[PDB]
Amino acid sequence: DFEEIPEEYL
Amino acid sequence: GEADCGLRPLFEKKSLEDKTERELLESYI
Amino acid sequence: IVEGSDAEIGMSPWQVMLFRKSPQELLCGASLISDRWVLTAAHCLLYPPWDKNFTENDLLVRIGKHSRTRYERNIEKISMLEKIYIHPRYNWRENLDRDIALMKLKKPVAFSDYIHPVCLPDRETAASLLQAGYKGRVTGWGNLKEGQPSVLQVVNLPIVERPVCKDSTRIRITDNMFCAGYKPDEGKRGDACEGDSGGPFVMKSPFNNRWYQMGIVSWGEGCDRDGKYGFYTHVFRLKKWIQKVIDQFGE
Numbered sequence: 001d002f003e004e005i006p007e008e009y010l
Numbered sequence: 011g012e013a014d015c016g017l018r019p020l021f022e023k024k025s026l027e028d029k030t031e032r033e034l035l036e037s038y039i
Numbered sequence: 040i041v042e043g044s045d046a047e048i049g050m051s052p053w054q055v056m057l058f059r060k061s062p063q064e065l066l067c068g069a070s071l072i073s074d075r076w077v078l079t080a081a082h083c084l085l086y087p088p089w090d091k092n093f094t095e096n097d098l099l100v101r102i103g104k105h106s107r108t109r110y111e112r113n114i115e116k117i118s119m120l121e122k123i124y125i126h127p128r129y130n131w132r133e134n135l136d137r138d139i140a141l142m143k144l145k146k147p148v149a150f151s152d153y154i155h156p157v158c159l160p161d162r163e164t165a166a167s168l169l170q171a172g173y174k175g176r177v178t179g180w181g182n183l184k185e186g187q188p189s190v191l192q193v194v195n196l197p198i199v200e201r202p203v204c205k206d207s208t209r210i211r212i213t214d215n216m217f218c219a220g221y222k223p224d225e226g227k228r229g230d231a232c233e234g235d236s237g238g239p240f241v242m243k244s245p246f247n248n249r250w251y252q253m254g255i256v257s258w259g260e261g262c263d264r265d266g267k268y269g270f271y272t273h274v275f276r277l278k279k280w281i282q283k284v285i286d287q288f289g290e
């Protein structure tokens with residue numbers, strides 16, 4: 001459903 | 011509160027009105 | 040939001056998305072009250088009956104958003120959480136009395152056209168604006184019916200008299216809550232719904248033209264049902280706890 005957020009945030 | 015709180019850059023700060031804020035003002039009788 | 044409309048760009052620049060890290064999902068709404076503090080509903084973080092108990096590292100806050108699902112490059116900011124504070128007398132057992140929580144961010148978020156804090160009411164603003172008939176505004180990315188919105192939704196709803204709120208439900212209503220919504224006679228409709236909770240009920244002061252957060256989306260029974268109302272955490276009534284947390288743990 002949700003677009004991938006940048007990995008730095010995870 | 012924070013000096014500039016509740017003043018929206020794209021509305022109050024520019025003196026633009028959103029499309030339904032007047033419905034709120036009109037209720038404040 | 041049920042029976043709302045698309046928000047305009049920058050219309051609710053204090054709106055925050057509470058976002059689960061894994062799996063990637065919308066948990067709740069929330070609001071920006073300074074560069075390092077975000078306000079939400081306690082039950083978005085803690086509800087033991089359904090095995091909900093998030094810690095800081097489970098969660099992200101996404102600020103400056105319009106689209107629900109898209110990564111809004113150059114527009115949104117995503118912040119990690121330093122610490123969660125749940126009201127110590129949050130009543131998850133009975134009625135969600137004191138459905139409030141603060142989240143301190145690891146670093147300040149920078150303000151922009153799309154990211155800006157809402158005011159917290161003083162006693163006089165509460166006294167003056169929290170009156171039956173007076174309308175506030177609710178925003179969120181929650182359900183459109185009791186699918187999901189492409190963009191942030193908005194609806195304006197009138198505050199309802201205390202006896203009508205109480206007579207609408209078997210739940211015991213406290214002084215730390217108020218309800219809002221149209222009556223069946225009134226014709227117009229609208230309510231918060233699942234996903235919207237923790238977001239802000241705001242009012243625009245006619246005295247100083249500022250937006251104040253008067254409520255937090257807390258609960259309802261279904262969504263937009265005739266004769267039922269949305270219940271909101273009464274923010275001014277819990278402001279001493281808010282100030283105590285910020286004074287103590289804020290820099």
Ligand SMILES: COc1cc(C)c(S(=O)(=O)NC[C@@H](O)[C@@H](N)Cc2ccccc2)c(C)c1C
Pocket residue numbers: 082086130131132133134135210232233234236257258259260261
């Ligand atoms: C604890 O008091 C509750 C709990 C629930 C879980 C509900 S509910 O009927 O399930 N409605 C909850 C929904 O409004 C939901 N969108 C918000 C929510 C609140 C609390 C816990 C989970 C979700 C209600 C009314 C009360 C008074």
Ligand code: NA
Pocket residue numbers: 220221230263264265266267268
């Ligand atoms: Na209703």
